[PDB]
Amino acid sequence: GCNRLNKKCNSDADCCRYGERCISTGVNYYCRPDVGP
């Protein structure tokens, strides 16, 4: 239950750490989906 995906994050802490995580989309870090469970 997390949906801050495709938003820019300063860190993992800006979004969920499970299901979401900050990956680099090139220039900036966005919260990208992780499979989670």
The CA distance from 27 to 36, in Å, is 25
Q: Choose among 12, 11, 19: nearest CA to 36.
A: 19
Q: Which experimental method was this entry solved with?
A: NMR
Q: Which residues have C-beta within 8 Å of that of residue 15, sequence separation ≥ 6?
A: 2, 4, 5, 7, 9, 21, 22, 31
The CA distance from 30 to 12, in Å, is 9
| Beta carbons of 13 and 19 less than 8 angstroms apart | no
Number of domains in the chain: 1
Which range of residues forms the domain containing residue 11? Answer: 1-37
**DSSP 3-state of 27:** coil
